[PDB]
Design an enzyme around this catalytic site. Structure first.
Site, mmCIF file in Angstrom:
data_model
loop_
_atom_site.group_PDB
_atom_site.id
_atom_site.type_symbol
_atom_site.label_atom_id
_atom_site.label_comp_id
_atom_site.label_asym_id
_atom_site.label_seq_id
_atom_site.Cartn_x
_atom_site.Cartn_y
_atom_site.Cartn_z
ATOM 1 N N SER A 175 0.798 -1.226 0.000
ATOM 2 C CA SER A 175 0.000 0.000 0.000
ATOM 3 C C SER A 175 0.830 1.275 0.000
ATOM 4 C CB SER A 175 -0.958 0.018 1.190
ATOM 5 O OG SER A 175 -0.266 0.093 2.422
ATOM 6 N N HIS A 190 -8.090 -3.236 3.767
ATOM 7 C CA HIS A 190 -6.706 -2.801 3.588
ATOM 8 C C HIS A 190 -5.682 -3.765 4.178
ATOM 9 C CE1 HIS A 190 -3.986 0.427 2.394
ATOM 10 N NE2 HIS A 190 -3.308 0.199 3.503
ATOM 11 N N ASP A 246 -11.470 -3.152 0.058
ATOM 12 C CA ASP A 246 -10.551 -2.146 0.572
ATOM 13 C C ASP A 246 -11.202 -0.771 0.568
ATOM 14 O OD1 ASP A 246 -8.204 -0.631 1.242
ATOM 15 O OD2 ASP A 246 -7.014 -2.281 0.436
#
Lengths: 837, 134, 807
Positions: free
Chosen positions: C674, C784, C752
């Site tokens: 991420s 996430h 997400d």
């Protein structure tokens, strides 16, 4: 002894696919569409007919209206190749940059139109009036009659309006060509062409622009009807004006309040927003439907004086219980009746019903006035269930129906009807029935029994018979000539691999006469005068050609009129550089059942060798893969597969169409469990007949049912199939709509045993533990089989640890449309077999 | 239910037109990327002639390009391209005609001009402009 | 020569990973309560789950007095809630009123409360928690006890503030912003999405600690109007429904919601019944009193209630300024233009807002919660407080500052247009308590403790080395010398007591698991600063990770521009000289996070060790961009997110190739989540000849589609940085990715909500238009962070296999 496919780089594979598409051989990209034949007075010129149609003459990537003059007395020794004359001078009909509004793009997805421009049109013969939708709105022109036939293209006239959204589904009133109708913002509208005035007749859609708050709709087909029954309209004009001039319109009003809603991503990815659809899944509730009339009266100058709208004197659901769908509907040619076709929920009892316009009364909320309308109805007015077809497998829905305009015989009503559940095959029948009456008391409500309006059969004469069937679906029709007592149709009497034209006298059911040459598969359309017809045909080894024939012969015996080749509109190409046409075969099974098939034997073959094979498969109903038509442009990737050294095996196992009912009725409640045994049995046979099949390296590959079948093979037959490339699969059967799953699978309340063993996501622990034995492909925007199906399967793979791979197509619905998603699909397809097979 | 149909697409032929005007010694080039047709050349000729621009014949691309591709105009650094990209697409003849202009002070030993495929970086064209053409 | 990892089957990798995880939580936030005698001396409350029912519960422990030294002591873990379940894991938080000794928390469906003090009895057995019966519809959120009254508390129901009573059970709705999802965009006393995610604030209400004079109680909340904020759609966790949810997601360049502060008063009597309950607002529109105010960072009251304060931020996030609002500036909402103009004149003259401290930087403003207002005497002229400035010298240090409250006696009836320095008070003194090239920890729940009886402030910083967190102390009346209170060679997370006599230290090192040790300070009364901590007892002890784990080794180096960077490497198990092993560059490389620090990694990243047991080297280095290293160091990313971080990774990866010898520069992957996924893709694009394959986990592909609070802070909202946006968005540079397959994997969670699935959806959509290949792994049930264990194992198995085959 074996043979190993050459290893190519990724760019190398891209190059060979680009080359195989460049060497396609300059296809036309579209053949001449639906035609209309218009006679001309002989003194007007040398020609005798004018022929209107749609097509793209390779000039633009835009389907357009064209016409051609049919010559008179063409000489035999020299082939005549008719022209394609434009009719709209430099008028592009695709929207800017080729982006459609959501309504019409969804309709194009439902009809599977992969061409840009005018896709359909409406044409009034007497006035010679053409009305269509082009760019973002309606257009119209005039060429046929009083205007005189044209020589140069002319400009189409835009129909000015004041509505907001798009005008959908234009229809020209037969009784008067000065008016027309359309659907706007989910409601019905009628307009004039000359005076430019409009009028709205339905007040169901709020216009709150939110599918959730305004559920009602009027004169429009819902999703399940468009997808699984192929009816793309909800309104119908009465073809006769009744006497002020009164016009009628039969239409349906749907109520989707209690239908389950789902969300689907939108073509605009950046917004990250979804569109809502009323999607009824198996076991849920279908929308509520009804039939309503909508009168309107005009005077000599064409002004809509009044505009009412009526309804049945009883609630639609009360007169007709156990009715879940409205398959088809329409009028008779005199205007004395309006008819419709009702399907019950299990889809095992279809029935024609005949309704007189007198049974429609204005919507009177004052109960005092309503009881006056229910009193003023004549005595002989009531619904008439002329025909009823009850089966044990399921009812396939036909459009074939032709009532005869009755003379002053008040009892009788004669009509042709392609019945299919009587003998197991689709055959034409001439049936005459007496409309018996009962003189109901509509004031007192009635709870109809099972046989309330059923009228008894007076005769039922089969016109065709045998172990073959008459083409009735996918846009196939019959043409009935009432001046000679004949009926022209299409069927598979010769061989299940060919579609041919036939004719038989419907008065005396004599001997059938084929009108097309054998060895091809024909798609033809007659003339309204029954003197010419155009046929579109091809074979496995020949690309399509479009010829026009002229029925000549002695006028006293019309049955044996010989079809004379008159001219041509398109010739074959033969695709010579790299296309080896496949070879059709056929075998028998251990249950003594003949199946057909085809094999793409590998290019540059050598004796004492073995090649890796790719068992391409669809297997699902309503689709026949093996027939004597040109597969050269539809499935050419299979030829490229063969060009590298793979041996492609196609086989139409039990469940496919064009072979009767009892043959297709093998999937009933056992969908998934039986179609693979026919694929493996037909794969081991090719190991005997031919010798180049390497059963050590067997793939499998499908799309949207073959994707579902690709997974079932790898589960049931892990030792036969090494890899499995499923495309847009259907993993769980409890998340598909009613119109299709209930037909074959009998809602989970009843078939919970078969739903279990058919849903491939509920058996994920039997998939291969080894990696590189499963590819999955799916489109993100798909609304036919949603991305949920692949998404739920992946979820089940992780709960068990089995490996997989995946490819998503973000800008692609159920059909790959753009070329970059097509190339990337094939390039990645070859690469998977190149490495893991 | 019907098997989904993969779309068929064929590349088309195209030409590249070079136009120029000389003011005192500065050259303004006008580069046109257009599908190979008849009317478009005898139209664009007049459209450029109105502004005293003239043509210079140079070979078109040999390869067959797809409609809808984007091409980077590249050169040696001494050039100025106000549009740096060109786009191959059909165009209504009575409507506007896109192009890319190039400003160069003095050509001298001749300037290179290249079109390059955006997606794969293919050199699908070239032109060695020299003062002889002027 | 080279080394080649031994290949295994899928079952082999899955089995070794199952075994590795088979061979693998400390007590949470604490509170001290003195026990007036008895054998013990204190009682310590915390949250935890002892080796049993997986449930974070309230556990107390008796700190004994006069413990013996010869033997180590290990406290028990007593229970407080008899056979209670707190899982919808466990009691995630609670609120504690010391005087009455009342605990109030939300357990997984409803609120509960208990009491341990005040009644002169400390409980001996775990008791039954009492349920607060409600007549509301939905779930109660964010409860808070009233510091001025232990009978009334506040919470949030359906985005509207509510006040209830424990003794009488009565409720009351104080605000009516929710019409009762998109039709209602107004909310009352809640933190929105950007505030909760990017600014670390999880509340909207703030009780007043002091009741005024029936007794009145004030509550400072804020109202948010999300009318013209964009809406997006995210799938729902129940996959079968195929329905999404709507959230207000203001993307960079869009418009944040409109904020406004409002009091909410209410009066009650001796019986605890609410008589009146008004709601007020500023005499002038908030948008006019403070133009150029985009976010409300923090808020609260002073010790005595004479003021309410908040911290304001603008859209560029380069001007944070403290403000001080008196409750007299809030008048009831009056519709009649007559009653408004009489109340706009009926307030005192000296009453006005004051801009106590304006912080102006050139990089950005990190939101520090460190601010200590001192209750003063009548002292109307001046005002003194402790504030943790960071933009003054480039490092986060403590400061004591006294400011005078100038007054202009505005006419609040007439409309006012404030100038640049309307309410700015001039500073009187500004002395730095701390200094140097280090910083005082201020974010991520780190705070200070200010003792006023002894004139001492306790804080946590990295004064010794950037790799450790220690507990320091210094005097705020005189800037003397600092004293560290924790044992070096570790990294602690301490929590003082309300009496300033004890502190627990939850600490670990690279080669030692976390252990919680309580230390009691014993030192001369005459010198409070020189009081020295004595180890008292150990609440929890380190496991030591004995059979399969091998801790990494921290190193540091210098770059070509002489910028000291840190790093760490897991050496390959069973290493032979002259063997070139295949390596893996695990990376995050983003702001607000550092990975190379002296703390136990064997519980957060043991897959890094599992990767080492196979024969892979692992290299983690924290280049320019990380935290705990100042501002001009972290501020190297400004307008260039992407273009700098990867340059230091290869600059450091090469260094390990010389310091050691087992790094095969031909076979090296790169992997992150991420922001390493963003960087992994930026590595494979900028350094294809350096990195063999890439494994991007939930990457940020395009910056034009990320929220304002995070992007605009580092990337200068698109209109002014159209160069750094296109040059930092990886989904716009797809034509530079590898053409060879088996060089790029992409993983992403479907649900997400932070970096939506659209980012990899759009990227894939750009990989097809360029013809490049890829692979893909979707986790339909993971947000996430991969939470569940099946999805976690199936992630590490396919990570070993993609490395086994294609490296």
């Amino acid at each position: 002894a074996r043979f190993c496919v050459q290893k190519h780089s990724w760019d190398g594979l891209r190059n060979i696919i680009h080359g195989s598409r460049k060497s396609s051989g300059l296809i036309v990209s579209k053949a001449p569409h639906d035609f209309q034949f218009v006679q001309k007075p002989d003194e007007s010129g040398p020609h005798s007919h004018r022929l209107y149609y749609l097509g793209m003459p390779y000039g633009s990537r835009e389907n357009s209206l064209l016409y051609s003059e049919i010559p008179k007395k063409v000489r035999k020794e020299a082939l005549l190749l008719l022209s394609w004359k434009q009719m709209l001078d430099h008028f592009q009909a695709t929207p800017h940059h080729g982006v459609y509004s959501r309504e019409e793009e969804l309709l194009r997805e439902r009809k599977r139109l992969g061409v840009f421009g005018i896709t359909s049109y409406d044409f009034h013969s007497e006035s010679g009036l053409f009305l269509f939708q082009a760019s973002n709105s309606l257009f119209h022109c005039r060429d046929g009659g009083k205007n005189g036939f044209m020589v140069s293209p002319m400009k189409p006239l835009e129909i000015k309006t004041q509505c907001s959204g798009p005008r959908m589904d234009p229809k020209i009133c037969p009784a008067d060509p000065a008016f027309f109708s359309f659907i706007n913002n989910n409601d019905l509208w009628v307009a004039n062409i000359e005076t430019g005035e409009e009028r709205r007749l339905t007040f169901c859609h709020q216009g709150s622009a939110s599918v959730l708050d305004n559920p009602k709709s009027a004169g429009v087909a819902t999703f399940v009807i468009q997808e699984e029954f192929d009816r793309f309209t909800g309104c119908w004009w009465c073809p006769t004006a009744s006497w002020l001039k009164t016009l009628r319109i039969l239409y349906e009003e749907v109520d989707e309040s209690e239908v389950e809603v789902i969300h689907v991503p939108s073509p605009a990815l950046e917004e990250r927003k979804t569109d809502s659809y009323r999607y009824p899944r198996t076991g849920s509730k279908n929308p509520k439907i009804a039939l309503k009339l909508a009168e309107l009266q005009t005077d000599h100058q064409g002004k809509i004086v009044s505009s009412c709208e009526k309804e049945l004197v009883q609630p639609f659901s009360s007169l007709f219980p156990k009715v879940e769908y409205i398959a088809r509907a329409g009028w008779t040619r005199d205007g004395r009746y309006a008819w419709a076709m009702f399907l019950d929920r299990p889809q095992q009892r279809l029935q024609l019903v005949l309704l007189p316009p007198a049974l429609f009364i204005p919507t009177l909320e004052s109960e005092a006035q309503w009881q006056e309308a229910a009193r003023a109805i004549p005595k002989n007015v009531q619904p008439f269930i002329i025909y009823e077809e009850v089966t044990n497998v399921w009812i396939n829905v036909h459009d074939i129906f032709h009532p005869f305009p009755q003379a002053e015989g008040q009892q009788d009503f004669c009509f042709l009807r392609a019945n299919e559940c009587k003998t197991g095959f689709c055959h034409l029948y001439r049936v005459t029935v007496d409309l018996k009456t009962n003189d109901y008391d509509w004031t007192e409500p009635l709870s109809p029994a099972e046989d309330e309006f059923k009228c008894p059969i007076k005769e039922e004469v089969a016109l065709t018979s045998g172990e073959w069937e008459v083409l009735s679906r996918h846009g196939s029709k019959i043409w009935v000539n009432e001046q000679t007592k004949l009926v022209y149709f299409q069927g598979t009497k010769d061989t299940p691999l060919e579609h041919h034209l036939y004719v038989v006298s419907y008065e005396s059911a004599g001997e059938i006469v084929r009108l097309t040459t054998p060895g091809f598969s024909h798609s033809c359309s007659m003339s309204q005068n029954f003197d010419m017809f155009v046929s579109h045909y091809s074979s496995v080894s020949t690309p399509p050609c479009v010829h026009v024939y002229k029925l000549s012969g002695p006028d006293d015996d019309p049955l044996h009129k010989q079809p004379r080749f008159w001219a041509s509109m398109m010739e074959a190409a033969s695709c010579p550089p790299d296309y080896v046409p496949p070879e059709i075969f056929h075998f028998h099974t251990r249950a003594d059942v003949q199946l057909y098939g085809m094999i793409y034997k590998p290019h540059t073959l050598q004796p004492g060798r073995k090649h890796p094979t790719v068992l391409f498969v669809y297997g699902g109903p309503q689709v026949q893969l093996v027939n004597n038509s040109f597969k050269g442009i539809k499935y050419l990737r299979l030829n490229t597969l063969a060009s590298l050294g793979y041996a492609v095996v196609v086989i139409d196992g039990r469940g496919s169409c064009q072979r009767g009912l009892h043959f297709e009725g093998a999937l009933k409640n056992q969908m998934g469990q039986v179609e693979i045994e026919d694929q493996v049995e037909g794969l081991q046979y090719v190991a005997e007949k031919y010798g180049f099949i390497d059963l050590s390296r067997v793939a499998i590959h499908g799309w949207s049912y073959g994707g579902f079948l690709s997974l079932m093979g790898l589960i049931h037959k892990p030792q036969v199939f090494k890899v499995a490339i499923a495309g847009a699969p259907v993993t769980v059967w409890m998340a598909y709509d009613t119109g299709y799953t209930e037909r074959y699978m009998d809602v989970p309340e009843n078939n919970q045993q078969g739903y279990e063993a058919g849903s491939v996501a509920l058996h994920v622990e039997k998939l291969p533990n080894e990696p590189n034995r499963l590819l999955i492909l799916h489109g993100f925007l798909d609304e036919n089989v949603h991305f949920f199906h692949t998404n739920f399967l992946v979820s089940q793979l992780i709960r068990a640890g089995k490996p997989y791979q995946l490819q998503i197509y973000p800008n692609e619905r159920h059909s790959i449309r753009c070329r970059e998603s097509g190339e990337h699909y094939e390039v990645t397809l070859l690469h998977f077999l190149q490495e893991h097979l | 239910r019907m098997i989904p149909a993969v779309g068929h697409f064929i590349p088309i032929t195209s030409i590249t037109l070079i136009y120029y005007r000389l003011y005192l010694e500065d050259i303004t080039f006008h580069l046109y990327l257009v599908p190979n047709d008849c009317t478009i050349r005898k139209a664009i000729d007049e459209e450029e002639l109105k502004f005293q621009f003239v043509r210079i014949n140079k070979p078109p691309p040999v390869d067959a390009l797809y409609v809808g591709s984007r091409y980077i105009v590249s050169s040696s650094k001494e050039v100025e391209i106000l549009p740096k990209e060109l786009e191959l697409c059909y165009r209504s003849p009575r409507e506007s005609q896109l192009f890319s202009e190039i400003y160069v002070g003095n050509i001298g030993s001749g300037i290179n001009l290249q079109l390059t495929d955006k997606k794969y970086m293919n050199l699908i064209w070239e032109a060695l402009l020299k003062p002889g053409d002027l």
